[PDB]
Design a protein around this ligand. Sequence first.
Ligand code: CL
Ligand code: CL
Ligand code: CL
Lengths: 182, 182
Amino acid sequence: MWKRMTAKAEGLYIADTKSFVTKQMDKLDFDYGGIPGDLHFGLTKKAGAREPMFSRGTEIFNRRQISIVSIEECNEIALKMGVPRILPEWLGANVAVSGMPDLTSLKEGSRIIFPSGAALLCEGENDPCIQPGEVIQSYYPDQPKLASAFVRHALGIRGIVCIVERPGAVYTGDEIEVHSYQ
Amino acid sequence: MWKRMTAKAEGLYIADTKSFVTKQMDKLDFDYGGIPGDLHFGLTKKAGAREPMFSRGTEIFNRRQISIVSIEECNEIALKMGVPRILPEWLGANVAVSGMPDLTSLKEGSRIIFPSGAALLCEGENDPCIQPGEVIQSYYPDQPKLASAFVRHALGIRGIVCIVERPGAVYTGDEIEVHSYQ
Ligand SMILES: [Cl-]
Ligand SMILES: [Cl-]
Ligand SMILES: [Cl-]
């Protein structure tokens, strides 16, 4: 029920301010709760549109600690939107991987392990919202309705979110071991 | 993306000793990490046969904070095993529900919410192991090879495991609101 495959962490990024657009780093520390100093770090978070069964603002466990996208799927989004490129930073990703053209399909329960031993527990698909779409729009202001275009074309290829299962440091270019749940 | 369903918490149980076998409680407190005082309580746990991508004993995040089974699937296990009954306690369950068919199939990402607001985040199917099988065998000494029969017949209907998404108290008989993912 565990099929193993090797992939690569092409880029690492952190949201060190209130902005969700991340900035590239040569290294990141993964600890329980996520990336220390990152916008989504912590044991808890406030409920929002992603957790509609809770009243907005309700304090709940922070399930979306780390955001991952694959270079292949980002290129796929770019093509579908008719734009030259889509940067992981614009989507607020913390890790951009290569060698995973179907990353979004990685089932919950799967693990992604780094050379240091740091490990991520897959918490499923990251549903596309309008915000990143509006960010993409700002980079191509001469192209109409890109925000809604993102929400439409990114569905199923916008990446996944994970919880930190084991602490450890991660570095740019790290070869990763994916344990795909079956 | 979410389907609402209603179920009922028929029983609540805690493992207050070193044994995973639980005992009925009229009330339980859910907090991040599970049930305070319970054998499986904690933000972390030690890796075992269930998390083979880690060496045994490795400290990792505890995604198996609360275990749930349904009265209906326990009856199903009993039928397939040829025994009068299978108690949630013997499987080390913390919550026994009724009113929701195929509990084990509840998708990861689903939410189970109690009247007090206490909420559980589904972390998937609970794989059956030999231990509860040995407990069952001890209650039916006249029955042969029940331990192995349990692992065999309980597969796919042994319940689920969850993490606590929102703290709160839960009581026997509580009506629960289930948000089924997909
Ligand atoms: Cl409330
Ligand atoms: Cl989004
Ligand atoms: Cl088991």
